[PDB]
């Protein structure tokens, strides 16, 4: 494990090789979850934010950018898609999180929360998955797709087995967030595959 | 009957089905009334905010959004539209009045006045109310389409039998409204008959 | 004789019959005028602001919007249009002056003031008038149009017989403006037609 | 010789017929100069601004605005444009500087310098000049064009016959100009031909 | 060499010949380089900002503006582009940074980081070059084209043979910037070949 504060994944080029896999001990399935990271793109087409996929189960918990102010979760092969006023190009702070009791997704772009939608309620997101960043995965872990991937920076990423309160995300934003158990940027155990930069975070 | 302070209705998805029915003991009918309530969808087609038949009378009173920026109220299948600048996707706070004497119909988005329109002078809108949020009525509580349901959140909900003055319509927006006599969110007495969350109001 | 301080005409549907009458014991032609006044409307086509006919002379006085940001005055059959930047829909505060002499015509839009154009040097605008409010003349007090018609509120009505200084006009703006000889606001005899509300002044 | 400080030139309409000459006892030709001056114009249309035409040569020095945002010099019938970010319709303040030696034209719009141009390194500007205001020449006085001429405002115009520094001409957009040997606006020798009015300065 | 400190090369009109020979004594090949400058134009095509070439290798090192808010580096005949929101004809300071190690372009555009790209990862960009500015080279020194020609102001530039710091960039752009041993325009060498002038800088 390292501890990446104040550093960033620089996907510097278009391709359908280049992507990063973070490793977490997942032995028990998702119920509940808030994912925060920190994302600088300019780009104006359609590509993926973070890609989990379980053996035989493709967007099993997906986090996609449609077009500029459109925001996509996929929760079992379902999608919720939420709007949102954005500058583009320009720094983003995404916040998702998702309850299987209600089956409500909340997004917080920026601080600012989105309007609240439902999918999959009662549903459990399974447990041992291949988690990329930079690339879309069709299987586990590849089958990826270039018009998909992420040329840019990726930052701040940090992921809980509960939703967290309007209070911890805003903490999330100023950048003091509280004890993350998945994954945690200050403890992170990746693996870079094929041209990644680690570079300081100039952008906040 | 509950209170609902700091909290709002969550409809997640769009559907024919999913609804809030209001129940209020309303005798005798309305000659003056004013009704207030916060709103957050990100739909950009029509859709029904407040829907309020009697019995084989349809539109009776009805806030309706047409687009963004124009707002429509129906009092006994006559409407009234009024424009607004507002930004897409945003919160709102819609305050709504109707008098029978002058048949004035004032709108108040954001604590803002919009340009008066009359409608229905010398009528009463009648008591023994179907009051759904979330779906438009086309009969005494049933007849829905899924063209014109609301996906989104509403929060807030007071009605009261008067015509309110500019400096309550404000404490209103400011979030410590008068006491209400017809619906008050305090003191709500409702049904939920589908898919439809209680979540906290976050966007205030 | 009236004092509408702090009130508003409400014209709350469109019409060929609904108007405002205004009288005035003037029959000494004018050579010099200031017309200030108060207007909200939401609508976008083309109306009328105010409409001064006299026997067999059409289009005599007329203040007409023409579009978003163009207005125009007729002084005796001839028209002048001046442009300004404006929000749609917004509350404004017109004032229009003409002078004989020279020609001018003054035009100032929430105290800006627009370039200065000319017509009917020489010209006296004619005595013993029909001073209509709402609608638009096309004879001696009637011959109205539809589409022409004005739907809003209209209110702080003043008319002076001399060609007011640019303090005068934002004294008029501010909401003190100086004492008016053809038409005030505060001593005004009026007559309603149709369906036109006295309403109080809630956008200043 | 007169004295035209917080007064205006006002052309009224538009007509092939209305202008103003300006008399200066300049006797040698120009290597170099700088012209000031204030325009309030709400036509959408190209115009002239300053017509120079000397005997024989038409388009001698004109400064011509082309569309919004568009301003142009010719300097003996070769001409340079510079664009700039504006708002229609606005009151403008224009600074006009050529040098003979390096060719340079330079445009000063609302106290912000354009980017610099270059034309006629080594021309000298012919003496004994008809100069007008209001419409464009092609002749030596006269020739003019219905299409071309300004319906607007004209204030504070001086012209010298040097290239002025920066100071100077924000000095001059502020409203405390330097004393100019060819044109000044404090002791003018013109001449009005036709409909052209002098109104006090109420814009800028 | 000379002191060009509040000056500026101004490139006054369209061509295939006007341009400015810049003279480095490079005996050892580029791995590290930052290269900060002003610029100036009001054109909306593309065109070249800094052209560098080898013997017998085209586009080695080339600044080169697509469109507005376009921005590309080309290492080696390879390019990439990144995004900027920017205003429309307006002053801009531009810093562009590569490295060997990584492959990572850095580019800064009014003291503001781009999204990073990486091309040409373990390349040396080669020694002995013809560095032109008004013009791209298509040759050692050579074959222009009028289509990609600079018509405008040039500024503060400056080259190291380092990537330079955030800190050391904002230096840059507010005008104190450190020593620089490639090109310093405190101690430019440089070679005037048509019509560029030299004049104040008067934009900052
Ligand atoms: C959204 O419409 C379609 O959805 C499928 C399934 O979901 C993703 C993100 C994917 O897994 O590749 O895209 C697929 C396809 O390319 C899209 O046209
Ligand atoms: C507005 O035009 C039409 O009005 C009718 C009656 O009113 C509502 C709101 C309704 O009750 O369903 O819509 C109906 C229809 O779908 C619209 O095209
Ligand atoms: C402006 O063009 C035309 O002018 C005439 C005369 O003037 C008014 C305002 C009027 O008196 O009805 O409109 C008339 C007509 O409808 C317009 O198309
Ligand atoms: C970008 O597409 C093409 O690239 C080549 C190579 O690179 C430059 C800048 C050049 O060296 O002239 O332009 C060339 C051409 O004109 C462009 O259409
Ligand atoms: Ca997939
Ligand atoms: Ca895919
Ligand atoms: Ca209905
Ligand atoms: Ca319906
Ligand atoms: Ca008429
Ligand atoms: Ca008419
Ligand atoms: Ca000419
Ligand atoms: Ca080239
Ligand atoms: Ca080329």
Redesign the interface.
Known sequence: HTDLSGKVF?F??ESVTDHVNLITPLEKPLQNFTLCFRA???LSRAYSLFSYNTQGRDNELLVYKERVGEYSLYIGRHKVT????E????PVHICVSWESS???AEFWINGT???????R?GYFVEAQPKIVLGQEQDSYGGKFDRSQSF???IGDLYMWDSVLP?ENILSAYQGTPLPANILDWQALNYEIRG?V?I?PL??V
Do not use: C, M, N, T
């Open positions: 620089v510097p080029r600088y793109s300019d939420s709007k949102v006023i500058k583009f190009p320009a209600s089956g409500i929360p989105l309007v609240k939608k439902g999918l309620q040329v840019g920076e309007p041209y930069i570079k100039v952008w």
